[PDB]
RNA sequence: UGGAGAGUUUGAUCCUGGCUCAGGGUGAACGCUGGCGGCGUGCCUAAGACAUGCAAGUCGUGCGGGCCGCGGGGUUUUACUCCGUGGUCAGCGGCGGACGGGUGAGUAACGCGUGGGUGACCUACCCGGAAGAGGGGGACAACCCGGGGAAACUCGGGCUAAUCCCCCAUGUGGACCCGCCCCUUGGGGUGUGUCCAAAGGGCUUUGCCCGCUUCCGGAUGGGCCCGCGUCCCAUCAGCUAGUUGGUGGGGUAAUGGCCCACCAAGGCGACGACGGGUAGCCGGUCUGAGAGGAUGGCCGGCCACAGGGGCACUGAGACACGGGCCCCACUCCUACGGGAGGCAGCAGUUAGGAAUCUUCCGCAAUGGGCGCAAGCCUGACGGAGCGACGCCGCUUGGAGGAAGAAGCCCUUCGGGGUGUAAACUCCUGAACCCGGGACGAAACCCCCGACGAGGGGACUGACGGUACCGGGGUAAUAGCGCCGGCCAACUCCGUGCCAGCAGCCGCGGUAAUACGGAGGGCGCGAGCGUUACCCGGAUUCACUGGGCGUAAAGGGCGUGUAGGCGGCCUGGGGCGUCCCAUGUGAAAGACCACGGCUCAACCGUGGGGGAGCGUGGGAUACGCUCAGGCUAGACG
């Protein structure tokens, strides 16, 4: 008994909580943004987009989202938002959306 | 991490290594990426160490990391001698 | 290990005379001298016509019983001559004739094949210097086959090499009675050997 | 090289997909006679383009759906049900041999 | 470079035909017997259950402490406190724990094999290249206090470090949306917009080492996809609803019904779907003249599994044998609430079985993880142990020695045999005693030199006082099967269709070469014989290479679907087919050569062969295809 490398599990747990939290913010803000854009809120719909974009790229900093997982999210988000805005949109803040 | 080490091919009390290039995780006598030399620890024949130095140099040219002994034998056949 | 036991009974069963003793086998005593019949309670009874098997079996038993060798070894030696290029019958005899114990015998160092075996075993022999006590060692072309310096004083080695004075030697050999040396010049050929054997049969026997 | 094949479009019933009937030929390993074996591939035809009866070249592609790894590369020769025939009829015979039987 | 058959259906014969044997092989086992050594090999059953020990850790050169002790300080003393330093313990953090080791249960499948695809992807550490590391904030263990529990263990409160976590900045660059260009599935370039970096440590401390960040590239390893190949039963014939496809979305590194909503009604099947059975697949291996049959232990490659089932977390990587959760079963602890386990790791125990080893030595060597290093860990490994289990080597002696001892066997009682065998003479001298005593081990490290190249130095062996060398030295284990024929080896006695033998034919009922013993003989020999299984013989499933009037075998006949097969001439294609080049066909094994150990077994080096498939080029007689023509088939 006592294969002191229990520590690994010990740590795994923390990390889990850390990651788990990181992604909720991502999702939350993403909807937050998509939902806005949807009902054409341009200016603020993008404002939130950006925060989201950031959190995402940030998760990829460490081993949270990491890689293309981050890339995906970003495009799927920007796509949804830019498209959703085509409801009289006119992307004010131009936030992350390339002019 | 690809390496350059020895692979046991002798036989009981009759060791004969093969200076090989293989990923670091394979059985020491498992599938290697390429042979590049051999070694008879007991020098039971005039020729008891050869090393395709042309080859060695190449692998080292790409992350090959030799065992301390593998490096020894190599050196001993001017693998690094940069005269 | 090797046969070991009454040997002239083989001499008799094989009909043909086998020199498994050297001296005496020349004296009016090899028994094949007045008693050329097989051993046992039936030696003198009429012989029924031998079967194709019998013949081959006997021919093999003969050749083999000559070089005094275990069927085990004999067979593998055969299977080897078989794979090697060249008429198997020959190749095979050439190989049997390459056993160290045989050469020591073919060089008059020993009176008989058995004796030569023992000389090899008790280290009284040399092969290009290094002594070799493996009676089944393959003597090959170029190999000099001396006699243990230490043994060079042994009465037996002396008497043997003595009478060897004069006696010629096989054309695939050559011995220097002085320093008690001899060279294995070449693998003897079928013609070179005069064995009372029909090796075409021995081949056929392992055909079955 | 992405394997390229040829066959007849025996099925046109799907959306953006066609059934190509690639016929193969080869000597039997033990009896050596050349034997004609075959197989259906569901080729991807986005534009509906290829219709029943065509002979198309099929080309190894990136998965498009489960059971679907080929795209119609090009048309070899248009129309020819003489081939679709063989297929259909062969299937039709099936619709028998089991408990009753199929008309000759 | 290669191929043998025999016995047995009859009064006899030919043929047909089954059965049977001789050979080779085995991870064997059983019997009688058993001396030495080398190499190799050893749970083939209960993927049954497991005591005990060991089997994955390592960094103090990422950080802060608890405890025990020593030395020196601010102290007049006291209290308190500061510094250095030894011992010890875990905690935080990092890398490894996804390798290495085991097993083959499941799986007939892209599992495996082979050849390809990835514009649809990932890859820690290693290597090359480019750029960078500026500033600020926080937490949680340890520790301290309190609470619950029989326990395993747990809950709350307070303090704190970092290469722990967060924020802002710098943007080499990279990421995303959009546009454009080149490319062609999601490849590459570019423009605007937004978004994203970093950590420190050590000193022989103004520099060098270790480390950190972003991007590109390499190297290795991998995911996924596809053509072809992969056992038995059709007394399994129809299977299918996420089932087949589509549109959109989720999901992953990534494609995809992988998952979901909506839409369409499709998808598979006799070229054998579905179902049943059996089974890890391969390199190979065994046998065979070959084709083929059989097989897949040991070794190498892949897969699957880790008491049974399901699931995710952390991560470069796991759905994670010595990590996690839940359910089941079983086991142990339990103050009955509740807990702890998983040898298909080494060795070992137990059970089952005809049957399968030491709870060994060592980390010296090779290899692996961590470390700047010294070094630590390594039941991986290297060795020793036991077992004729296999292969090879070796001994039980050599030479002389009677017309031939004794005993035993037979006799035509003259004699014949065991047999030069013995006794005996002489010679050598396994065991065994004495002495010497090894390769495998030179690196890491240290010093000069720049921590480079190069040069010098030091430490280090389990095996092992073994191998081997030299001296001395004893004649010093032989057994087992068989002798009617196949099949090599014959007599006497005993028995009397009994006792028994037996592979097949058969033998035994008073002259038995066939039972039992003896003498003698044949064959092998530390083995010999048996049983079991595979190939052979068996052209007895016949592709090589079998057949169907009466031996087994023509369908009761027709009409006809699919399928198989297709006259003569010419032209196009070039699918089959043939040729050349080229890539692949790993290592091992097989073959050849030379070499190392006194030989060989075993091993090292080198060389040649190799079907299959990929790519390019070529040929066109035949087959296919297309087109044209013809009348000799067919139809009218
Ligand atoms: Mg009869
Ligand atoms: Mg017969
Ligand atoms: Mg099945
Ligand atoms: Mg707290
Ligand atoms: Mg720039
Ligand atoms: Mg930033
Ligand atoms: Mg199974
Ligand atoms: Mg055959
Ligand atoms: Mg993850
Ligand atoms: Mg375990
Ligand atoms: Mg070690
Ligand atoms: Mg090491
Ligand atoms: Mg006979
Ligand atoms: Mg009688
Ligand atoms: Mg056959
Ligand atoms: Mg036939
Ligand atoms: Mg027949
Ligand atoms: Mg009949
Ligand atoms: Mg009829
Ligand atoms: Mg024709
Ligand atoms: Mg062609
Ligand atoms: Mg040699
Ligand atoms: Zn004689």
* Domain CATH for C69: 1.10.1050.10
The boundaries of the domain holding residue C103 are 97-193
D85 near D100, Cβ under 8 Å?
no
Distance C185 CA to E37 C1' (A): 33
Q: Does any strand E atom come closer than 7 Å to the Cβ of B55?
A: no
How far CA C62 is from CA of C13, C16, C68, C199, in Å, comes to 9, 8, 10, 10
Ligand nearest to the CA of A19: 9
Sheet containing B65-66: give its strands across.
B49-51, B34-39, B17-22, B3-8, B65-66
CA of residue C177 to ligand 19 center, whole Å = 94
Same-domain check for residues C41 and C62: yes
Same-domain check for residues C138 and C78: no
- Written as six digits, the tokens of A95 are 């936030």
Tell me whether residue B65 is exposed, middle or buried, using C-beta atoms within 10 angstroms of its C-beta: 0 to 12, 13 to 18, 19 or more: middle
Same-domain check for residues C167 and C202: no
Angle formed by the axes of helices C88-96 and C71-83, nearest 10°? 130
Q: Does any strand E atom come closer than 7 Å to the Cβ of B76?
A: yes
- Written as six digits, the tokens of D90 are 């062969």
CA distance A78 to A44: 14
C89 near C199, Cβ under 8 Å?
yes
User: Which protein residue lies nearest to nucleotide E490, measured between its Cα and the C1' atom?
Assistant: C42
- Protein fold of A1-99: Methane Monooxygenase Hydroxylase; Chain G, domain 1 (1.20.58)
Q: Does any strand E atom come closer than 7 Å to the Cβ of D47?
A: no
A84 near A37, Cβ under 8 Å?
yes
Q: What is the CATH number of domain B1-83?
A: 3.30.1320.10
Q: Does any strand E atom come closer than 7 Å to the Cβ of C62?
A: no
CA distance A42 to A87: 10
Same-domain check for residues C69 and C158: no
CA of residue D5 to ligand 3 center, whole Å = 31
CA distance C82 to C84: 6
Q: Which nucleotide is nearest to D46 (CA to C1')?
A: E246
Q: After which residues is chain D broken (C to N over 2.5 A)?
A: none
Q: Which of residues 12-51 of B touch strand E (CB under 7 A)?
A: 12-18, 23-31, 33, 38, 40-45, 50
Same-domain check for residues C87 and C117: no
Place of tokens 């998965």: D63
Tell me if residue D10 falls in helix, strand or coil: strand
A29 near A46, Cβ under 8 Å?
no
Same-domain check for residues C122 and C157: yes
- Written as six digits, the tokens of A60 are 């990829």
Tell me if residue B6 falls in helix, strand or coil: strand
Same-domain check for residues C22 and C110: no
Instruction: Give me the CATH number covering residue C186.
Output: 3.10.290.10
Q: Does any strand E atom come closer than 7 Å to the Cβ of C2?
A: yes
CA distance C164 to B1: 71
Tell me if residue C37 falls in helix, strand or coil: coil
Tell me if residue B49 falls in helix, strand or coil: strand
Q: How many helices (H) and strands (E) does chain D have?
A: 1, 5
Q: Which nucleotide is nearest to D100 (CA to C1')?
A: E237
Q: Which nucleotide is nearest to D33 (CA to C1')?
A: E543
The conformational region for residue A57 under phi > 0 = left, psi -120 to 50 = alpha, else beta, is alpha
CA A72 vs. chain centroid, Å, equals: 10
Q: Does any strand E atom come closer than 7 Å to the Cβ of C152?
A: no
Within 10 angstroms of residue C172's Cβ, the number of other Cβ atoms is 20
Distance B27 CA to E99 C1' (A): 9
CA of residue B36 to ligand 5 center, whole Å = 44
Within 10 angstroms of residue C88's Cβ, the number of other Cβ atoms is 20
- Go through the domains of chain D in sequence order and give each one's CATH number: 1-104 (2.40.50.140)
Domain ranges (residues) in chain B: 1-83
Q: Does any strand E atom come closer than 7 Å to the Cβ of C156?
A: yes
First and final C-alpha spacing in chain B: 29
DSSP-assigned beta bridge partners for residue B21: B4, B34
Same-domain check for residues C164 and C113: yes
CA distance C145 to C16: 30
Same-domain check for residues C76 and C117: no
Same-domain check for residues C67 and C139: no
| Cα-Cα-Cα-Cα dihedral sign, residues C189, C193, C198, C201 | negative
CA distance C202 to C56: 6
Same-domain check for residues C53 and C114: no
């Amino acid at each position: 008994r006592n294969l002191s490398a229990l520590k690994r599990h010990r740590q795994s747990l923390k990390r889990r909580l850390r990651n788990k939290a990181k992604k909720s913010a991502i999702k939350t803000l993403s909807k937050k943004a998509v939902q806005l854009a949807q009902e054409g809120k341009a200016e603020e719909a993008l404002k939130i987009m950006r925060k989201a974009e950031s959190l995402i790229d940030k998760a990829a900093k460490g081993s949270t989202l990491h890689k293309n997982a981050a890339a995906r999210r970003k495009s799927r988000l920007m796509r949804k938002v830019r498209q959703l805005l085509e409801a009289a949109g006119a992307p004010l803040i131009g936030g992350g959306l390339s002019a | 991490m690809v390496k350059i080490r020895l692979a046991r091919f002798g036989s009981k009390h009759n060791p004969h290594y093969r200076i090989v290039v293989t990923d670091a995780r394979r059985k020491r006598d498992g599938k290697y990426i390429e042979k590049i030399g051999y070694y008879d620890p007991r020098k039971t024949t005039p020729d008891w160490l050869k090393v395709d130095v042309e080859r060695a140099r190449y692998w080292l040219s790409v992350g090959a990391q030799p065992t301390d002994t593998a490096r020894r034998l190599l050196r001993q056949a001017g693998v690094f001698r940069q005269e | 290990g090797r046969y070991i036991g009454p040997v002239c009974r083989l001499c008799r069963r094989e009909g043909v005379k086998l020199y498994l003793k050297g001296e005496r086998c020349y004296s009016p005593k090899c028994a094949m001298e007045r008693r050329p019949y097989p051993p046992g309670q039936h030696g003198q009874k009429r012989a029924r016509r031998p079967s194709d098997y019998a013949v081959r079996l006997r021919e093999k038993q003969k050749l083999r019983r000559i070089y005094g060798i275990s069927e085990r070894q004999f067979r593998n030696l055969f299977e080897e001559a078989s794979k090697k290029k060249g008429v198997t019958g020959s190749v095979f005899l050439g190989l049997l004739e390459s056993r160290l114990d045989n050469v020591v015998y073919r060089l008059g160092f020993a009176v008989s094949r058995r004796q030569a075996r023992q000389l090899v075993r008790h280290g009284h022999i040399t092969v290009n210097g290094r002594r070799v006590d493996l009676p089944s060692y393959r003597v090959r072309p170029g190999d000099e086959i001396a006699v243990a310096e230490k043994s060079r004083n042994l009465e037996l080695i002396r008497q043997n090499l003595e009478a060897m004075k004069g006696r010629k030697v096989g054309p695939w050999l050559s011995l220097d009675v002085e320093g008690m040396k001899g060279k294995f010049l070449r693998l003897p050929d079928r013609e070179d050997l005069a064995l009372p054997v029909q090796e075409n049969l021995v081949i056929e026997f392992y055909s079955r | 090289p992405k394997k390229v094949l040829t066959g007849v479009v025996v099925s046109d019933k799907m959306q953006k997909t066609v059934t190509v009937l690639v016929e193969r030929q080869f000597p039997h390993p033990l009896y050596g006679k050349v034997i004609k074996r075959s197989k259906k591939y569901l080729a991807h035809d986005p534009e509906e383009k290829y219709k029943l009866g065509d002979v198309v070249e099929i080309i190894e592609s990136r998965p498009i759906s489960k059971r679907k790894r080929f795209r119609v590369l090009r048309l070899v020769e248009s129309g020819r049900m003489d081939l679709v025939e063989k297929y259909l009829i062969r299937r039709q015979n099936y619709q028998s041999l089991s408990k009753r039987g199929g008309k000759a």
